[PDB]
Design a protein around this nucleic acid. Structure first.
Lengths: 89, 95
RNA sequence: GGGGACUGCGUUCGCGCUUUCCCC
RNA sequence: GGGGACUGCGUUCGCGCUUUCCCC
């Protein structure tokens, strides 16, 4: 059986970022476990306008890397990815 | 039939023993120079006597900061004129 | 931004201009 | 030398690099 996993992305609420759609919403994506974490950033960009280089992703306290797979982090159905605006310095 | 002779001037040298390349021992120099000589000639005589280059010398005569291009006559120097010698120190904003 | 040295010059002797540099 | 913004980016989340700059 197995299959793609359903993941949740907690988007921040940042109304001052008027060019992006950061409304504190939860995105639901279903992705293969073999997908790289960068696919999450593609889906988030499509959903919010926020480019991948501006996104910082955290999963159960882990700063997950774009080049690694979802399987590398042992994500299951309902895995919650916390999205933050990446801060320089 | 009068002919204006040279003037005898005295240079009070400072006592600065830390300037080991020069002879600044607090001595008094005596030079005899024509009144038509430029003040710059005094610095030459001082350089010859003390090793101190003309560009490092500051001269003062009766409170006047005399200028190199002017003559001794311009400053009305007479026999026994006392030239005070000091070290020139440059200034300037930090670059 | 600050400290220091140096090349030469101007000065109302307080400083300023300038050259080549070093350090924080 | 120090503090910071900005471009792209890295991070072991303490920070780092980079781009164009600002302030002292």
């Amino acid at each position: 059986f197995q299959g793609p996993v359903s993941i949740k992305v907690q988007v921040p609420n940042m109304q001052d970022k008027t060019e992006w759609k950061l409304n504190g919403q939860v995105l639901v994506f279903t992705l293969p476990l073999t997908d790289q974490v960068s696919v999450i950033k593609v889906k988030i960009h499509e959903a919010t306008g926020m480019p991948a280089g501006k996104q910082k992703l955290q999963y159960e306290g882990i700063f997950i890397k774009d080049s690694n797979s979802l399987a590398y982090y042992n994500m299951a159905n309902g895995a919650v990815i916390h999205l933050a605006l990446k801060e320089r310095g």
